[model samples]
Target: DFVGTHGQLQVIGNQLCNQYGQPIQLRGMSSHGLQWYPQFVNYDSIKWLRDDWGITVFRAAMYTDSQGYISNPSVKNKVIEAVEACIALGIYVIIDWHILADGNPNQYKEQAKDFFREMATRYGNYPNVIYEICNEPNGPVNWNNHIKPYAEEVIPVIRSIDRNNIVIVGTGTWSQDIHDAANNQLSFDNVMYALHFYAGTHGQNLRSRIDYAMSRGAAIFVSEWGVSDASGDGGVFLSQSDVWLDFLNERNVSWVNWSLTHKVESSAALNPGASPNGGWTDANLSPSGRYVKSAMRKNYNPPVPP
Candidate 1:
């Protein structure tokens, strides 16, 4: 079951599969400037990721778009205390509008549609929550003059109030060029096409441009990754990311492993310590958080595919 009731989910053919028709392998990270950075919400960095690495998705912070962005009352309790620490730690939250590249979805469309429709009517009965309208819209806003007019203007105000939450949609520069959303066609339809892979030296052509936009059907979500070692070399250089993990295991694509906090003494898994001060931690997690999660966690499956 998609489990998330009332705000919709559990469809399949039209997308949003579940009810045992799995396909929801969304791992997590990108804790963004440490959610208000106070020792990263303290408590030993949220119990080292909700009690020692169980990790249940997380990518909030970066809600930029300038002009009174989200009414800026100190960002309403720092985004509701980072979504109440992922709803008191059960985990699974992504409120990111993080739009980079002088971010401008029509200069913050109505304060991002009143903050993603009041955060989907206050976390639309949570099913681990998700919503990422803009995070990367690089270089002169390609992809049809800035992500198809900002997804035809804020995905219809988030489908007139979060219909079955799971709206991801970033596909430019930092989101690593989505061949203009597989040749233009991302006007909302069970959205989920974000991408961000950083294997050092301007991302080695992102696995044949994400396999030519998955051979045209388009459905990808790497979320984020930074295999590090941009010539300072502490180690791990995942050159082709093992052929981008054999084309994401022959196209079962679904990933999220760009981080887990690399500053608190590197346990986000994998580091080469090449100090040149890009920001914090000398970056490069052993060619992917320790050899690509120890070669995809020794086949330790986690892609919930149906």
Candidate 2:
């Protein structure tokens, strides 16, 4: 089955389909940032996630300026290692050019073009790679003004080489504003817009916005989210998060949770000093970690039997 096979992903009628054009939904974990949690981006960790957590996708956040891919270009290799490892483990992977601090993706447009070009050239043949051109575009950025123009530039770089794999573009206002993209969509196929949220901070307003965007024919992907506050720290809004999860499940919207790190925050799915190579018992997880782990476990590969 395509579930555990190497097949290119496509967008079909607002849904992500497999090589055969059958609809599919991906659920998994996103590493905090490659620079800080490099230790977890290994073969063992990936295998553990595949075997234990039942994640179908793995997102490697190659932060552009957070002392990550931009400040130390060498870190790209480390993130690449994680991507390669995910491929080996028979799961999908997202090469995220996490854009947050700069707000405007144009800030590193050239570097992004080069980075994706190299990645596409190296891993384009593999159907398991998905390029998330930008992570979260915020700080007064709008789709038409800043984000769209930036995507128009960098997307071509990846498409020039890798044309079949799915490309995820982040929307403005921390990727929660999908309505903007719905109104002015990108002129490309097999592309989806990103929508992110932290249940504690974003509630019905964001969901209603996404609902409206879907009504207008915009393909959506929850590239990142947390049960805590939007700031990535605070108490786990387990009850509210469940509401969002139910909504995503009903719509078959693919998602990858906020983090797989141990950064002493409520959003992180690991304890502050837990082992980086997976295989953690309940004792090793933080309160938020424990909650997210269980939530993910509920939707693993075999699925909850419907």
Candidate 3:
């Protein structure tokens, strides 16, 4: 339904503009890691998030290490499954080359080129497909040397085939150093920078960073965020999440929650032994799950009381 509402998305100045040139912020969930949570990549789960949870986008994050795509190639099929499901559901989907343990994206440069080459060739024509070149570039990395050069090489592979879809590049310092990436941005048109945060650990310091990044004329996308601290544990910080979301809403910055899994973490929307398919009742939701559900299950733009 979201795709039907907004045909294609593009980075227009500091906003994500719809086909009509109107700004829109997409709120949704990013899969935990395709390698570990393959069961949730099906049509049923994604449909549930769209129809029930009011999700407009889904990030199919395939981690590069720890039994992820680089180690187990079969994990890529999960991303394919998610893309197909989102396409069918009339929603946007992100194919995330999640690079966590690998630290710098250049560690898997050749593999990334090949992987993105295949993805662009196969799904380039689809409007719902958005390519996230890298998830989070942390640990001894920067925009110029480590991350940007890697993007320079990998982005061409995708643009060579599909030039229409949006490409998101990760910022330095685990996607929090937006100022650096914004100051030294890519030369492409439809490219946006990633900014990931957790309400508990990230506070006003992160917001200050984002403000500076925006000052440099960079369009931002919160490719991932958590209601808890950055650890993905079950320590909820709901009030801070509200503040963060409020700030983002005012700025018209699009965002996706950290994850969708039954993993015993607060970020997971489901309970420990929840059913694999959708149909999650309140009893099945964790505290963070309920918080995100209520936040997403309504118009993102609420009334501005007089």
TM-score: model 1 vs. ground truth: 0.30
For this target, which candidate reaches the highest lDDT against the unseen true structure?
Answer: 3
What is the descending TM-score order?
A: 3, 2, 1
Model 3: colliding residue pairs: none
Per-model CA lDDT versus the true structure: 0.57, 0.85, 0.87
Q: Which stretches of candidate 3 lie over 4 Å from their true place?
A: 298-306
lDDT of candidate 2 at residue 261, scale 0 to 100: 86
The alpha-carbon root-mean-square deviation between model 3 and the true structure, to one decimal in Å, is 2.7
The deviation in Å at residue 268 for candidate 3 is 1.7
Per-candidate TM-score against the hidden true structure: 0.30, 0.95, 0.96
- Residue 275 deviation, candidate 1, in Å? 33
lDDT tens digits by residue: candidate 1, 1-306: 212312233323323344355544444556543333323443344434444344456665554644324435355455556676666665667777776645555666667777788877877667667777777767666667767777777878777876666777787676777777887767466676677765544454777777787677676677666555332233445655566655665555655554544453322452435221222232444334455435443333543433
Worst 10 residues of 2 by lDDT: 297-306
Ranking by lDDT: 3, 2, 1
Winner by TM-score between candidate 2 and candidate 1: 2
Candidate 2 CA-lDDT value: 0.85
Model 2: per-residue lDDT, tens digit, 28-105?
889887888888778887788788777888899989987888788988987788888877788899999998897889
Candidate number of the best TM-score: 3
